[PDB]
Design a protein around this ligand. Structure first.
Ligand SMILES: CC(=O)N[C@@H]1[C@@H](O)[C@H](O[C@@H]2O[C@H](CO)[C@@H](O[C@@H]3O[C@H](CO)[C@@H](O[C@@H]4O[C@H](CO)[C@@H](O)[C@H](O)[C@H]4NC(C)=O)[C@H](O)[C@H]3NC(C)=O)[C@H](O)[C@H]2NC(C)=O)[C@@H](CO)O[C@H]1O
Ligand SMILES: [Cl-]
Ligand SMILES: [Cl-]
Ligand SMILES: [Cl-]
Ligand SMILES: [Cl-]
Ligand code: NA
Length: 129
């Protein structure tokens, strides 16, 4: 599923991601834009053999099981394929664990390089919410 911008903002807010660990909704929408282009089916292979999955490009080295990242963890206790669902519940629940793990949203490379420090509230402009 390719979400619209406000559609994704609304889904994230409903699932309690807005202001989670102090990160306003626009931070999360910006992160999703540049991680996945709002596409729940996005995947990307990393140099270490891990893969990033879904709307928030969650990495199999730490967070989910894909059976092909030897020596990795599965800290969200989920198959990585669950992070590709049109329903973003699994991705949001896992993202809450990630952003709580010490480094905040710096876990998302695209957030750190393209969203952090910018006018992220613009990502929810026009949305009813
Ligand atoms: C080349 C490149 O940049 N590729 C991107 C991927 O790196 C990225 O997916 C992210 O992958 C990184 C690296 O594996 C991962 O970051 C690591 O996360 C773990 C878990 O949170 C950290 O370990 C914690 O460190 C804190 C701080 O000391 C400890 O307090 C805590 O106890 C540790 N937790 C555990 C379980 O040990 C690592 O420190 C951290 N490493 C680095 C270098 O930051 C991110 O979590 C991954 N992000 C996501 C969203 O999964 C991927 C993301 O889409 O994007 C690639 O492009
Ligand atoms: Cl957009
Ligand atoms: Cl594995
Ligand atoms: Cl980047
Ligand atoms: Cl915001
Ligand atoms: Na894993």
């Amino acid at each position: 599923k390719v979400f619209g911008r406000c559609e994704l903002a609304a889904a994230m807010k409903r699932h309690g991601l807005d202001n989670y660990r102090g990160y306003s909704l626009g931070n999360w929408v910006c992160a999703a834009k540049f991680e996945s282009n709002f596409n729940t089916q996005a995947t990307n292979r990393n140099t270490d053999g891990s893969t990033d999955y879904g709307i928030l490009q969650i990495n199999s080295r730490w967070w989910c099981n894909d059976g092909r990242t030897p020596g990795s963890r599965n800290l969200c206790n989920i198959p990585c394929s669950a992070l590709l669902s049109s329903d973003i519940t699994a991705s949001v629940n896992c993202a809450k664990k990630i952003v709580s793990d010490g480094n905040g949203m710096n876990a998302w490379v695209a957030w750190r390089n393209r969203c952090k420090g910018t006018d992220v509230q613009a990502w929810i402009r026009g949305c009813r919410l």
